[PDB]
C-alpha cells in the first residue's frame, strides 16, 4: 500500500511506498484522522499527517463519511464526492469505499500538517509554486500592495523587471484582471441612471397630455 | 346540520343576500333572490358560471337530492337506410334549491354547461318549464 503524501504550505507531493507491516498499523483509521509519523516509520518522527482520501485495488474512491471498509454502491448527484457529473441533473449510482482503512486500499492520500524533524527530499526540500495569481482587483491589490490609482497589470510588470537579474528573455505570467472600476463601467451606470429619470418625466408627460387631451376639465 | 358556518359571497355592488345574473338572456328566480339556502354550486347564489352549451332536456330522475338525471332525446340519421334513430343521453344535472318543488319529473329543463361540478356533473338547471303548461 503506497502513501500519497502532500505538503500544503510547500505545495510538494510524493508517494511513499511503505512496507506491509506498516499498512496493518493504519487499519481501522478513517479520513480526517491525524496519524503520527512514528506509526509509519522512524524516518517520519515528529511529523503529523491528516488522512484526506484513499483509493482501492479495484480503483474506487474512498468516500468520506460512510463508516464502512467495504465496497458500497451509492447514488450520487452533482458535486458529490466520487462522481463527476457531466450532464445537468443526472444522478448515477457509483461504487465507492467507506472511509475506514483496510487491506483493500492501494493508496492513502494524506497531507503534512506539522513538519517533522528530518527532511523528506521530494517533499520538504522542494517548494512548488502556486499555479495562478488572482484575477480580482481587490485580491490583486492586497497581494502586491498596489497603489489604488495605478494600473494593476502595469504595476506588476514594473515589479518583474525590477527584481530580474540581467535576464535577456523574460516571459511574463498570465495576467488578466477582473472586477475593477473602469470608464466603461461608469459610463454605463450614469447612462442607465439618466435614462431612468428620462423615462419618468416622459411617462409623466404622456399622463399629463392624456389628462389634457381626453380629460380636459378634471 | 352543517359542517362549516353557512356563508355566501360578499355581494358586490334585497342587498343582504348574494345573487348574480348568469347572463345569456336569463332571469334569476325569485326563490333564489328571496331564499335562505346556501348552495355553493347554484348558478345564481353560488360559485359557478355558465359557459358553453345550453341545451333543453326532460327530467328523468329526481332522486338523490341536489342532482337530477336529465334525458336529452335526439334523432340520428343513418345515411344508408335513410331513416332516423331515436337516441338519448342522460345527464347528471345539478338542481339548485331555488328550483326545489318547482322542477318535477317530466318537466322540460334548460341546462347550462358549468365547471365539472362533480365527477359526472357538468350542467346546472338555470330555468325550467312545467309539463302541464
Amino acid at each position: 500500500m503506497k502513501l500519497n503524501v502532500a505538503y500544503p504550505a510547500k505545495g510538494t507531493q510524493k508517494m511513499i511506498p511503505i512496507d506491509f507491516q506498516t499498512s496493518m498499523r493504519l487499519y481501522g483509521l478513517r479520513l480526517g484522522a491525524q496519524v503520527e509519523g512514528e506509526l509509519i516509520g522512524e524516518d517520519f518522527r515528529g511529523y503529523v499527517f491528516k488522512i484526506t482520501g484513499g483509493d482501492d485495488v479495484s480503483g474506487l474512491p474512498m468516500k468520506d463519511g460512510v463508516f464502512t471498509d467495504k465496497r458500497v454502491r451509492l447514488l450520487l448527484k452533482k458535486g458529490n464526492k466520487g462522481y463527476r457529473c457531466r450532464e445537468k441533473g443526472v444522478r448515477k449510482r457509483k461504487s465507492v469505499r467507506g472511509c475506514i482503512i483496510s487491506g483493500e486500499i492501494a493508496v492513502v492520500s494524506m497531507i503534512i500538517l506539522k513538519e517533522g524533524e528530518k527532511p523528506i527530499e521530494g517533499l520538504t526540500d522542494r517548494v512548488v509554486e502556486c499555479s495562478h495569481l488572482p484575477k480580482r482587483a481587490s485580491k490583486l491589490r492586497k497581494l502586491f500592495n498596489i497603489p489604488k490609482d495605478a494600473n494593476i497589470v502595469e504595476f506588476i510588470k514594473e515589479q518583474i523587471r525590477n527584481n530580474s537579474d540581467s535576464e535577456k528573455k523574460i516571459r511574463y505570467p498570465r495576467i488578466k484582471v477582473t472586477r475593477l472600476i473602469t470608464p466603461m463601467r461608469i459610463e454605463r451606470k450614469r447612462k442607465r441612471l439618466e435614462e431612468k429619470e428620462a423615462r419618468k418625466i416622459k411617462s409623466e408627460n404622456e399622463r399629463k397630455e392624456y389628462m389634457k387631451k381626453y380629460y380636459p376639465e378634471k | 346540520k352543517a359542517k362549516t358556518y353557512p356563508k355566501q359571497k360578499k355581494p358586490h355592488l334585497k342587498p343582504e343576500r348574494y345573487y348574480k345574473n348568469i347572463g345569456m338572456g336569463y332571469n334569476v328566480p325569485e326563490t333564489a333572490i328571496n331564499g335562505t339556502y346556501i348552495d355553493k354550486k347554484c348558478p345564481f347564489t353560488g360559485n359557478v358560471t355558465i359557459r358553453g352549451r345550453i341545451f333543453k332536456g326532460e327530467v328523468f330522475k329526481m332522486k338523490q337530492e341536489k342532482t337530477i338525471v336529465v334525458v336529452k332525446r335526439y334523432f340520428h340519421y343513418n345515411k344508408k337506410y335513410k331513416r332516423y334513430e331515436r337516441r338519448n343521453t342522460k345527464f347528471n344535472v345539478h338542481l339548485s334549491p331555488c328550483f326545489f318543488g318547482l322542477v318535477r319529473v317530466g318537466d322540460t329543463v334548460t341546462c347550462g354547461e358549468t365547471r365539472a361540478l362533480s365527477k359526472t356533473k357538468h350542467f346546472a338547471v338555470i330555468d325550467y318549464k312545467q309539463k302541464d303548461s
Binding site: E206, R207, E209, Y210, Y214 | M24, G25
Partner: protein
C-alpha cells in the same frame, strides 16, 4: 408530437405562402413573434419568393447580416421573422417601401407603397385593459401595445399608429358603413363596406359586407379589418382592389359575354 414544434412540413405550411409541393419536405417555421402563424409569413419567404433578392439561404443570410431589411422601422435581422398584415417592409437599399397585404387569390402580396405611406401602419385592437397605476393601455392584434389612447377606442377598432413615433396618431371605429378588409375566411382579401353588424350574445358577432361591385357577403367581425371610413381609404389599395371577380366574369372576359 408534444412540445414546441421546431419543424414545419411543406404541406402543413399555410397556402397563402404559395409554396410548391415539390420544393422540399420542410417549410420555414416562423419565429413566434408579433403575428399569429395563421396570419403571418416569414421574412425568408418574401426575400426569395416575392422579391427574389436571394435565391439561396447563403445570399439570404448575407442580406440579413448586413441589416438592409427593416420592417416597421426596426431592423429585424431574423430569417424566420413573422411579418403579417398591414406591416411595412422598408429597405433603404433600392429605396423600396412595401406594405404586406392580401390578394384576391387568397395569398400574401407585397404592395409597393410610397415613402410617406410607409411612415405609418394600421393595427386592429385586441383588448383594452387598465394597467397598474391606472394606465389605460390597449393591445393590438399584432401584439403591439400603446398607452394613453383615446377612451373611445374600444374592441375591434383599428388605430393608425406612427412608425417612427411610438404613439397612435389616428383612430378608426368599427361601425356600419366603414371600409373593411377581410383578413381570414372564404372572402379573404376582399374590400367592402360594412352593411350590418349582428351581435350574437355569447359568441361570434357577424358582419354583413357589400363590396364596391355590389356583391354581398357575411363574415365574422374578427375577420374584419377596417381600412377606411365612408369618405376615405386610410391605406393604398393593391392591384385588383379587392373585388374578387366571379368565375363567370373570368369566363366572360375570355369569350365575350
Amino acid at each position: 408530437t408534444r412540445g414546441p414544434r421546431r419543424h414545419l412540413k411543406r404541406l402543413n405550411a399555410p397556402s397563402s405562402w404559395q409554396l410548391d409541393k415539390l420544393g422540399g419536405k420542410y417549410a420555414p417555421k416562423p419565429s413566434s413573434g408579433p403575428h399569429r402563424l395563421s396570419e403571418c409569413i416569414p421574412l425568408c419567404i418574401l426575400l426569395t419568393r416575392k422579391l427574389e433578392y436571394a435565391t439561396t439561404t447563403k445570399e439570404l443570410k448575407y442580406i440579413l447580416r448586413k441589416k438592409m431589411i427593416k420592417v416597421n422601422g426596426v431592423v429585424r435581422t431574423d430569417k424566420d421573422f413573422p411579418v403579417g398584415f398591414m406591416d411595412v417592409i422598408s429597405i433603404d437599399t433600392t429605396n423600396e417601401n412595401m406594405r404586406l397585404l392580401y390578394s384576391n387569390n387568397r395569398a400574401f402580396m407585397l404592395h409597393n407603397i410610397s415613402s410617406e405611406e410607409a411612415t405609418y401602419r394600421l393595427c386592429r385592437v385586441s383588448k383594452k385593459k387598465m394597467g397598474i397605476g391606472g394606465i389605460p393601455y390597449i393591445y393590438t392584434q399584432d401584439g403591439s401595445t400603446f398607452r394613453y389612447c383615446d377612451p373611445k377606442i374600444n374592441v375591434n377598432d383599428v388605430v393608425k399608429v406612427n412608425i417612427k413615433e411610438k404613439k397612435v396618431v389616428g383612430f378608426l371605429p368599427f361601425k356600419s358603413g366603414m371600409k373593411v378588409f377581410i383578413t381570414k375566411g372564404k372572402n379573404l382579401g376582399c374590400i367592402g363596406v360594412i352593411s350590418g353588424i349582428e351581435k350574437h350574445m355569447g359568441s361570434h358577432d357577424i358582419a354583413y359586407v357589400v363590396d364596391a361591385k355590389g356583391r354581398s357577403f357575411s363574415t365574422r367581425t374578427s375577420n374584419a379589418f377596417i381600412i377606411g371610413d365612408s369618405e376615405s381609404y386610410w391605406i393604398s389599395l393593391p392591384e385588383g382592389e379587392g373585388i374578387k371577380i366571379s368565375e363567370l366574369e373570368k369566363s366572360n372576359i375570355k369569350y365575350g359575354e
